[PDB]
Amino acid sequence: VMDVNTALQEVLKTALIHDGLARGIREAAKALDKRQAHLCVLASNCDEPMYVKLVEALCAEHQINLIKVDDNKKLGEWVGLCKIDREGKPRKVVGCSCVVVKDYGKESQAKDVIEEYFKCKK
Amino acid sequence: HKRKKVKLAVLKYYKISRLRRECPSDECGAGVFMASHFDRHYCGKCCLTYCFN
Ligand SMILES: [Zn+2]
């Protein structure tokens, strides 16, 4: 079934290959303030309370759709700041807490996040 | 001797209430923050230096 996990992987890869993915918090900050965002997702595994609270306030300001991933390293692997190392499993994964989609890039299966938007709207 | 750049743990310019100003320029603004020194204000990427007494 086309769930939000596989569709999220798809849209994040598509954003990456078209250079429309701003990884981090400083880049997420300036991108969110510039009103050039399309989607934001933060990781549950953040011990810092100010980070999560700031992301909630900033996302709430422009009311963009929100997703969770529940693992800092998994989200880092998804966004693509890693080295493949001749296999599907990669090594030396860098945690990425927040990432904002500057551009979808290619309109392939982009509807699924909007489907999830209606699911939250419900 | 060479300069060794100092590291900061996180960025805290917010509380939505911003705690610094933003560079009034064509190229940059609304997201780039102007340094608030003890006397002056200064934008890093552009060098606009609003002195204030
Ligand atoms: Zn500037």
From Swiss-Prot, chain A:
GO terms for molecular function: RNA binding; structural constituent of ribosome. One of its GO terms (biological process) is ribosomal small subunit biogenesis. InterPro entries: Ribosomal_eL30-like_sf, Ribosomal_eL8/eL30/eS12/Gad45, Ribosomal_eS12, Ribosomal_eS12_CS. Keywords: Acetylation, Cytoplasm, Nucleus, Ribonucleoprotein, Ribosomal protein. PROSITE patterns: RIBOSOMAL_S12E. GO terms for cellular component: cytoplasm; cytosol; cytosolic ribosome; cytosolic small ribosomal subunit; Golgi apparatus; intracellular membrane-bounded organelle; membrane; nucleolus. It holds the Pfam family Ribosomal_L7Ae. The modification N6-succinyllysine is found at K119. It is found in: Cytoplasm; Nucleus, Nucleolus. Part of the small subunit (SSU) processome, first precursor of the small eukaryotic ribosomal subunit. During the assembly of the SSU processome in the nucleolus, many ribosome biogenesis factors, an RNA chaperone and ribosomal proteins associate with the nascent pre-rRNA and work in concert to generate RNA folding, modifications, rearrangements and cleavage as well as targeted degradation of pre-ribosomal RNA by the RNA exosome. Subunit of the 40S ribosomal complex. Part of the small subunit (SSU) processome, composed of more than 70 proteins and the RNA chaperone small nucleolar RNA (snoRNA) U3. Subunit of the 40S ribosomal complex. Belongs to the eukaryotic ribosomal protein eS12 family. This is Small ribosomal subunit protein eS12. It comes from Homo sapiens. The lineage of its organism: Eukaryota, Metazoa, Chordata, Craniata, Vertebrata. The gene is RPS12.
UniProtKB/Swiss-Prot annotation, chain B:
The modification N6-acetyllysine is found at K12. It is found in: Cytoplasm; Nucleus, Nucleolus. There is a cross-link at K15 (Glycyl lysine isopeptide (Lys-Gly) (interchain with G-Cter in ubiquitin)). A zinc finger (C4-type) spans 23-46. Part of the 40S ribosomal subunit. Part of the small subunit (SSU) processome, composed of more than 70 proteins and the RNA chaperone small nucleolar RNA (snoRNA) U3. Component of the 40S subunit of the ribosome. Part of the small subunit (SSU) processome, first precursor of the small eukaryotic ribosomal subunit. During the assembly of the SSU processome in the nucleolus, many ribosome biogenesis factors, an RNA chaperone and ribosomal proteins associate with the nascent pre-rRNA and work in concert to generate RNA folding, modifications, rearrangements and cleavage as well as targeted degradation of pre-ribosomal RNA by the RNA exosome. This is Small ribosomal subunit protein eS31. It comes from Homo sapiens. The gene is RPS27A. The chain holds residues 93 to 151 of 156 of the full protein.
